[PDB]
Amino acid sequence: QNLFTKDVTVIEGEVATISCQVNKSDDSVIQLLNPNRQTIYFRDFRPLKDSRFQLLNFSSSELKVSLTNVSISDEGRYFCQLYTDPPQESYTTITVLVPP
């Protein structure tokens, strides 16, 4: 496996940072999906009309996205996909804690 990510804990109302990392990249497409397996980012393109998501970094090796004003409705598995042949998938679990 060349694709990795890491779980995220975030306090409700704060900003979550979600990252898909690629080791030894060959520049295959990186995608990040939400818990309903809807695409948030496809490379640097966001088809999902939720402006709380922003692109923090995009390179051959990384797709890093922030989610601002997280709510409990955002909790769950976010799926990184890498379009090697065959493709790879690795999910991160976002846990949302009670606010202050």
Partner: protein, 96 residues
């Protein structure tokens, strides 16, 4: 789940997604295995047999040539506008 399609092994499956017409929207086809075939005009799965037949704001259509038994399953078409709508297409492949 709005449609079920039966195709014979060895023939061509056509998956046509026609939706409402919305500005600044995207269309996407997913395999049963959960990977993107196309997002708008952009392929994702590579070295694959899937062909783009038509892409416009309210239509994404793809060809699955030379169908095998393993091409069976539920394909999904997603339409990204103010919200995301999903059409599910169950594909049945007949042997012989």
């Amino acid at each position: 789940h709005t449609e079920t399609i039966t195709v014979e092994e060895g023939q061509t499956l056509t998956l046509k997604c026609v939706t409402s017409l919305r500005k600044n929207s995207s269309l996407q086809w997913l395999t049963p295995s959960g990977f993107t075939i196309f997002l708008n005009e952009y392929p994702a799965l590579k070295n694959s047999k899937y062909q783009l037949l038509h892409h416009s704001a309210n239509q994404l259509s793809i060809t699955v040539p030379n169908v095998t038994l393993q091409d069976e399953g539920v394909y999904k078409c997603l339409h990204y506008s103010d919200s995301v709508s999903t059409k599910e297409v169950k594909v049945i492949v007949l042997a012989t």
